């Protein structure tokens, strides 16, 4: 729109306009430094974001999903436009945040926190190993023997259009094991620390999702700080019910931070 175009423009006229470190801003060059090491995990400052334009604190929680998407789109359209040399290897991006003036302990988050901006910590426990999932929907026709084609995918929902090279026909189908896009996976099970309990009873816990960029960093019993966001499996079997819906809650990680972080770590001041 007129205004709904200006989101990406604000990012563009942010990353090379809001400048500190005595000139020659990070996000002028920090993105270059991300492309250099082949990471694709650029991270953003909420502090600096508010120091530029406060506006995108309220325009986030109504759908932080679309905020993050409309950001990383800008990272591509900048990178491959100025670094078309990049356009072989990965050519896909998403960004992170590390400034949220809040720690929500566990046993603190409830129905108001639904599907919006979050922070919390805890302790790791046993979880899964290393697996991928899918990323794109494509099958194979057999009435005409064609491909159904690739189809636009919703987060956990079916598509099934009639349009396809088989005279837009062939309701039935089969599926291949290739020509389709993949995505690593790993899980976590988060517990709360033995210091900040309610002083003597059993503790609480909920589970957390990490994604293909995010695996083989955690371990059982490790130190941590994560933004994450509040999930909802939208149906853990609604019907003629219990005395209670069998619902659950997860957090999906955007930016995980280790609070030990025993590697060579810090950025550089300019001088």
């Amino acid at each position: 729109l007129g205004p709904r175009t200006e989101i990406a423009n604000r990012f563009q006229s942010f990353l090379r306009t809001f400048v500190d470190e005595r000139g020659a801003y990070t996000y002028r060059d920090r993105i270059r430094r991300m492309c250099e090491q082949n990471m694709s995990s650029f991270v953003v400052s909420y502090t600096d974001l508010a120091n530029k334009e406060h506006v995108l604190a309220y325009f986030l929680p109504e759908a932080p999903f679309q905020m993050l998407e409309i950001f990383d789109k800008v990272a591509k359209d900048m990178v491959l436009s100025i670094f078309p040399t990049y356009e072989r290897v990965t050519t896909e991006i998403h960004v992170r945040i590390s400034e949220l003036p809040l720690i929500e302990e566990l046993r603190t988050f409830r129905k108001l926190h639904l599907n919006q901006l979050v922070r919390t910590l805890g302790v790791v426990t046993a979880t899964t190993g290393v697996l991928p999932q899918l990323s794109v929907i494509k099958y194979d026709c057999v009435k005409c023997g064609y491909v159904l084609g690739p189809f636009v995918q919703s987060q956990n929902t079916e598509i099934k259009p009639g349009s396809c090279p088989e005279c837009q026909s062939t309701g039935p189908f089969s599926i291949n094991m290739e020509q389709t896009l993949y995505r690593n996976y790993q899980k976590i099970t988060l517990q709360e620390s033995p210091g900040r309990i309610p002083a003597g009873r059993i503790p609480r816990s909920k589970d957390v999702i990490l994604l293909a960029d995010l695996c083989d960093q955690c371990k059982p019993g490790d130190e941590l700080e994560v933004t994450g966001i509040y999930t909802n499996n939208y149906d853990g079997s609604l019907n003629t019910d219990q005395g209670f819906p069998v619902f659950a809650t997860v957090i999906i990680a955007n930016h995980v931070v280790v609070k030990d972080s025993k590697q060579v770590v810090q950025s550089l001041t300019d001088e």
Binding site: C35, E36, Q37, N38, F83, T85, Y86, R88, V89
Partner: peptide, 12 residues
């Protein structure tokens, strides 16, 4: 060096 591999765009 890496920066010129960058402009070259060789993978590491």
């Amino acid at each position: 060096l890496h920066e010129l591999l960058l402009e070259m765009g060789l993978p590491l």
